[PDB]
Each structure stands twice: as C-alpha cells, then as structure tokens.
C-alpha cells in the first residue's frame, strides 16, 4: 500500500485519480480523489444531511455550522489532513495491514445476468479465408462471450452515467454536526446479508478534544471508522435491534438503561468489551451463527465456483481470495485496544461511548503541517501546544435534566445534567435474558495475521467495472428531539456543589458555607473545601500589604504548601479487600455522607455502597439448567456421560458468574466512574481558583516599586509554581482514582458476590436433586457403585465460587493505564554510559531527553557498577540541559551520584548550576565537599561535608524538599546533614547543570537528578543494592584484582597492618604491637587457578602469596594458626567472599571456616582458623589496601 | 528455537499445544527444541 500524496484540490479531472461522480442517484455531484486502491476522499461535506437543520433537531454537544468546508482552501486543507492521517496509519505494520485489508475487501460480486458463478458461454470469431481445397469455415478463435461479467456493486458512477470507478471507501467531510464521525453503508440489504456494500465515512480531522491529561489522536478515530467499515464491507452487520445494556442512568428517578449496538462495543475497545467477550461466552445471539454460516457459504462459493473460472479477471478473483483468507472471528476480535497498544496512543477507556454525560468537551484546533505529522502529534500526545478552537462558544447545550435546588420555595441554584445520547430502554435486559445452556457451552491480540501487504500490493487495480443496476438504496437522516425533565430538590446534589465551585468573576473569596455561597446576592463567594488555604488567608487577613519581593515569595510558597497539604489529604483504613487510602475531603466536595463528624468516620461505619445513590440494582438472569436425559449403559459410559454433564454445568456456572460481573460493571461501576469524573472536576476547579487567586495577587503587585528584572523573576517563579500546582492536582486525581476503584471492587466483593452465592446455592440444590433422581432411575449398576457415583457427581459451594480480586483488578486496567505506567518516570535525568566497541555513548535514558554536551577528552572506566565518566585531562566540562533544571521557588528535587577524586587540596569546582548569583553548587574544599545553595534574595546555605579524602568512592545524595523546607545530605549510607531551608526562597537558575574537573582527575558515576525528595530508607537501599554486583572490592572502594601488591588490615584494627613474625623456627603474620608502629606491613598478592582472570569475584578459590622467598599461606594442624611456606603446591586454596552490608571488606574461608584474629597473646594476634564463638563475629572481616 | 538443517542459525518455530482429547485442559509443550547445556569458562570456582 502506498498513499498517493501528490494530489490537490487544484488537480485536473483526469478520470483516473481525480473524478467527478454522482452522489447515489440524486441530482448532486461531487469530486473524488483516489488515494489508494479502492480508497477515495471527498473533501466536501456530506450530501445526505442538510447543513441547515432546525434548531429543535440539533443534538446536544454538537457544533452546527453550515459554512465549514465551503472554500477551496479549506477543502485542500481537509484533503491534505486525510492524506497525512492515512500516511500515519500506514507507517505502522498493523495500520498497513488494516489498510490493505480495507483495500482488498471488495463486496462480493453478483453472478451472471442469468445467475451463477460458473463458466460463461463461448463465441467463435474470425473465420479463416477459404483455401484452394478446404472451406476453412471452422478455423476461428473461441473466446468467452461475457468475459468478466460478474456485475460488481462497489463503484462510483460518473456524472454522465457512462464511466464507473471501483471503490470500497469514500471519506467525506462531516455532515450537519461538525464534530461527529460517522460510518454509513451504501445498501442495507447488501450490508446485512453477507454480500458486502460500499462504505462512506464522515470525518472531522481539524477539531480534537482533551481527556484527562492528553489529546485524542484523530488517527485512532479514523482507525475506529475503518474498523466499523470493515463490518459493512464483509456484509456482517447485525440488525439495529441487537443491543446490549451499556450504562445505568443513575441520574434519573426511574430505572432506565442506555444501550449500545454490538458493533460499537466490538469496535470501540476499552474495558466494556472485556465484560462481554468472555470465555465461556455468557452473551450469545443467533447473529454470530448466521454470520459465520453465510461467510462460510460465500467462501465455499468462491472456492468451488469463482476460483476455477478462467474467464474472470485477477483484479477480482485475487482480491476475493485475499478477502476470504481471513476468518470472521478475526474481524470480531479486532477493536481499538489492539491499535492503541501497537501505536502507543492513549484513549478513553471506560464508557467511551457515553462521554457526553460524564463531562463537557473542549475542542482544540489542529493545523496539520504544524502540529500533526507522519509520526503523529508533535512533542508527544501530552506536550503538544494546541490552541483552543473559537467554535467552543457554538457548542449547543441541551440538558437531559435540570436540577433546581429550591430553598422556602425560591430557586437557589439551577444545574444541568446531560445525557449519554444512546437509546434508552425501560425494560430490564438482565431479568428477561436467558443464559443458553446448549449454545456457547465450549471453549472452557493476533487477528491480522492472514493479511499480506506484498500480495495485496501485487494485485492489479480494477480498471473495467461491470455495474450492478441497484447498488444504492437511499439516505434518510436520523432526526431526533431531546427531551429535558426538571427535578426540584431541597437536598443539594453533587452537581450543585460542582457548579457552586465555579465562578465567572475575578474578585471572589473562598467560603466553606455552601448555603452562604449560593445565597450570596453579590455573587462574590465561591465554595471551596480547602480548609488550610482558607485558614491561611484568614490568618493573613488584616495585615501589612505585600509590597516587597520577599513577602510575595513567602506568600506564594505558603499558598502552594497549604494547597498541596489540602488536596493530597488521605487516610489509610483497613477494608475487607486490603488497605484503602480514603480521600478526606471527598465529603465536602460532591456532598456525600456530609452530615456531620468526618467523611472517613461515616465511610468506615457504613460501607462503600453508601457513596452511590442507586443501590440494589441486581436481577437474577433467567436460568435454564436442563436435567440429564434413561437408556441403560455400563459403568464407564455412565461415568463419562456424568463427567460431561458435570463439566457443562460448571461452565454454565461460570457463565452466570460472568453475567453477574457484567451486571456489576454496568449498574455499579458506572456510578463510581461518575463519582471519579465529578471529583476530577472538583480538583480542577479548585486548582483554577488557586491559580486565579495567585494571578490576582501577582497583577495587583505589578503596581509597586519593584524593578523590572525582579518582576520577570516573579513571573518565572509563578509559572513554575503553576506547573507544581498541576503536578499536585494530578497526584490528587490519581489518589482519588485509586480510592474509588478499590471502593468499587470492594462493593462488588461485599454486596453482589453474596447474592450470586445465594442464588447459585438455590440453583445447585435443584441441580443435585435432578442428578440424584436421574442416577436413581437407572438400574444397570450396583448399589455401592451407584452410591460412589452419586457422591462423585455433587455440587458443593466451592464449585461455583469464582471470586478473584486480582482477576478483577487486572480486568479494569486498560492499555491506556499500561501506557501511563510505562511512561511514568520519577527522573529528570538518568545518565547512562555505554562503551560499546570503540564508540562510547553518554546519554539520558530518563525519557525527558536532556541535551548532553561533552568533550572528546572524557573516558569511560568501570568504577562501581557499569561504566563511569573519567575526567583526566584538565579543564573538562559536561553540560546537561533541561527546562526542569531551572528549579524555582517551590519544587523538590534531588541529586545522586558516585564520586571519586584522584587529586590531593585546593577548592575545585565540581558541579555548578549558579546563574550569576542564585543557584546551587557542590565543590571540593579542604579535605571534603561543600554544598552551597543561594537564592535570589541574598540568603545562603553552605554545608561542609567532611571526611571526603582522595582515592575513595563516595555516594553523594542531596535532597531538597520544599513541602517540608528540608535539606537532607547523605554520604554513602549515613545521613550527614539535616537542615531547614525555610529561609531559602526562589532559586531560579540556568537550564544547564555543568560538571567540571578544574585540573583534577575525577570519576563520576550514575549522575542522576530526580523530581522529588528521597528518604533515608530509599537512599540506604540504593547504596547497598548498587554495590551488590558479585565483585570483591578493596578498602579504597575500587575492584580488587589479582597480582597486585596489597596491605592487609583487620576490621577490628583499621590501622594496624599485618607483619611477619618469626618464632620457634616458624614464620607467621600478626598484628603489630603498640610499641612497634613504624614497622612496614607485609605485601600480599592473590593468585588464581587461571592466569587470564584479573578481577576477583564472589566465591573464588585462590592462594595468598607473600612478597623474597615467595611464601604462600598454609594452615598448621597443631595450633590451628596460619604459617608461610616456600612451596606453591603446599599452599591452601581458600575461598574469597564478602558481606553485602560490609562492601569494602572481604572474608577468607577454608572448608566453611572463616579465618579471623585470635585473642591477645603476649603482644601478638595471629590469624587463626576459628571454630569457637568467643571471638567476635566482626573479627573475621578483612580489608586489602592498594599499596 | 530449533537447529536448521542447512543454515548455521537456529530457526524460530511455534510451540505445539494440547488438542488430544479434552477441551477443558490447554497448555503448550516445553520439552521441545534443542537441549541446551551450560559449562564453566575457567574452572576457577570450587568443584563442590
């Protein structure tokens, strides 16, 4: 497949790629551009729907405008947009496969004019001229008379009704409603009877909307439209009456359901299909059987008749082959989830067909060669800068319900609740649906595999089209009127509180009294649950007006801290399904259990069921458990039959369980999702109010005696604080998401499962009674055998117990959640170095793509765990650039790396982020490090971290937490500094962290910058796990290597080096006495069996060699000490190991007996192979120092 | 993986499954493919 990108609205009509065809059999014509085999684009609006609809017929949430796509410039932009979307889809393998299948899935052609797909007639032409002896009348050529006479139905007819162009898909523009993608068939009868039909798509590529924290890629909408069109192309279209219960309309006062067609469920993806496409199937209709049978019939018709016909073209014969290569289950098991996973596109995952009721959409304009591209949205799906469309003011709003909060009969507040827009049924589907027994009683990501891109591309295009006279029927637009009820209530609804949290003024004030807020004549009070922020604002009320920059910085920091403390308030309680972090303010916003006391107290005393306002919606499905059919049989045959009946009944029980799960999802989880959406709206409203308050304060402070540069500092700090507030709001949003998801799972566990257990116990009683009656009616078996058989075929409770909390947690997590989890990183910079082969690479692998600039003089060594930067050449520099490195007034971060200085003691800069005055830095000084942080007000904090000497590894971890006004500094696994930085203010600095050497060879490893603060436990865990790499180290922290001069130290005496002692004609080594400290220590080497090995490792056998006669270690079995011999063969092969919590120390073992230091003995301490416990366990740890 | 008859490169083959007599039980065979062994490099550790 190759999209024709060389077309434009100004291209001439050449009757091959640009045509002017007639719309169905009406009086209107339209231009069409072929962009792929049997794929066309019509850049104008749709013709069936009138562009000027009556106001009484406009649908809710639809932008109606009868001027879109009227000028040639807009038409060309639309054409280029469709080309770009098609090319983006074609880039991925799955998209290419889908496009190839669309192109090759022509509707099944009809037979000959007389009926049939077998061989045609014959005709003889061209009699040879008469010869001198022979008449030659029969010397002619025989040709098939109606060659390629199969009358295809997929064609567009020209304006003269004389030229016909084969086509499967026509991509029009939007109809009357601008934001409404639609997929309409050409002929209903040919679309529902397995033949196939042409498809037309209304697409709007210029307007998108934002969901959660991302924008919807229009490519996924086009993919959904194409998948739905595949249903029409194959002719597998169920009747419009085949619907499923989608959502329970909890906002209404009556028990009503909103239902969705099975096609939309099967195409839209998300989580809803997971509750119907279950193994075994609980929902089955005759539609699937009929579709499979008709598809098999058509495949047989092709294989036996339309395949061997040598008088039809390979333009059809070979596309029909490829179309019938795949199965129907491939189409049915093809939804948006697969394309979302293969494209890494985040999409709405719960009730995506009813998003109109849950929240109001804001539309963003897309300029295609500015924002979209061949690779999708520019700068990802989240960080793309899209301007809000000016058409948002034209969105027609027709509420389904109007809630009037009557006071005492004056309306205080009037709120609107919108509808899903689907078909509403008042009859309970579950109570009138019977789970089949003899149907779908079997079966206890890979669907587009039978599609070959090359084979499809090798098919010649259809040139000659034999028309079928009646291939279109008509177009009748669906005009509907939306009704609106009014409900008067005295108790406020959550929507009333949500509306009250919104104001249009710019001089408001927060208030905790909802009644006062709604009864305020001045409309200057706005409801808010931020008790901390309100308390702080009341505390600072009637004080000195803010005029200085320090005062404003303090005010902003306090506001941010109070907001973060308020929106992230949770309490951990113990619920039946584990531990739940209940959101404390959830009672105030969205008034629920807001009677008195605390929300958590009422939530604990009550259940999770009390959160939703429509409980007890279950209904027992119609159960048809047929009894066992009484012909005589032997023991084995009867046992096999009863086993089969047992398995069938177990599968039926699982089907009923799945039906109850779907009931829970439709009736119960919908309300919890509604609560999640309202809570998200509340969080966003409070964030907007806080941001507006901050903006008001900043703009009122712009009329003050503050220099311009300080004002730009204020603006940058306020932008950074806005980003931080957004981060805190996201934290609160996912907190409430987890809380309410766990609440819904708990409500299923503790409110629906017991009812299912009761119902199935009642049913199992009857099932067992029938089984016993059948087994007693038979008389071809013994009595003991009959008793054993009846005891074997029994149904205990455990038979129909299928609850699995992990199987429901993993069932309501979508591919979007997995994408968010994979893309969630807590690192602003995670440096990674890879030597490769003669090509070193240093880059950030945190996913934030920091710009790393380094000189070629740097090297890569193996420092601790992996490669590490080595700066030996003087005056070197490595720069890391990222916007988030600019810091600001309120943002927590942490630096974490490994450092090794090979120098010897002047102050040399090591790490800098100082923009002129403000910033932070780390630099050597004296015999240690210094961490200095300075703000843009003169306040300084210089901390001297001592005991940092050269030729030693150090794990530096500095954390700045501005929610606690805390500065923590850890060296290795020990907290060194714990300071308060409440006096530190805005530290806005450059966007480049610089690492220098300043005439000092340094090893730097694993330089990392996080976007949060770290705890002591996490620092200790990271330090101890980083060193757990099966390498034995020396006292310097570097890797221990064989064949190197080493000095020996004991852990108990970290300064005495073992020295040789001669006594009784025997040479040992021992601790130096206190009176002899100038004696030089002994020189050691480690020898391994294989000389190729250079570095020591855990569990390594070796020999210690002492450096004139080349002594070797031996163990004397007289005093159980050690001694030195002059024979390598007489040495002892000892095992080297180390303890995880003592990294730079190692142990020597000899048949599971560590070598340690003995007790004092006339000013001596020999190494001995201990077996007694009177020697401390820390005395067998040794250290080797590079000498 | 299975060793190719001609090329010195292991080819990738789809695992078998269980379709003998029962539809209630499904799995894939694991004892298929080439039998791999692991041997030491330098014989420097303890023999025990």
UniProtKB/Swiss-Prot annotation, chain B:
It is found in: Secreted; Host synapse, Host presynaptic cell membrane; Host cytoplasmic vesicle, Host secretory vesicle, Host synaptic vesicle membrane. It is a multi-pass membrane protein. Signal peptide: none annotated. Responsible for host epithelial cell transcytosis, host nerve cell targeting and translocation of light chain (LC) into host cytosol. Composed of 3 subdomains; the translocation domain (TD), and N-terminus and C-terminus of the receptor-binding domain (RBD). The RBD is responsible for the adherence of the toxin to the cell surface. It simultaneously recognizes 2 coreceptors; polysialated gangliosides and host synaptotagmin-1 and -2 (SYT1 and SYT2) which bind simultaneously to adjacent but separate sites at the tip of the HC. This is Botulinum neurotoxin B heavy chain.
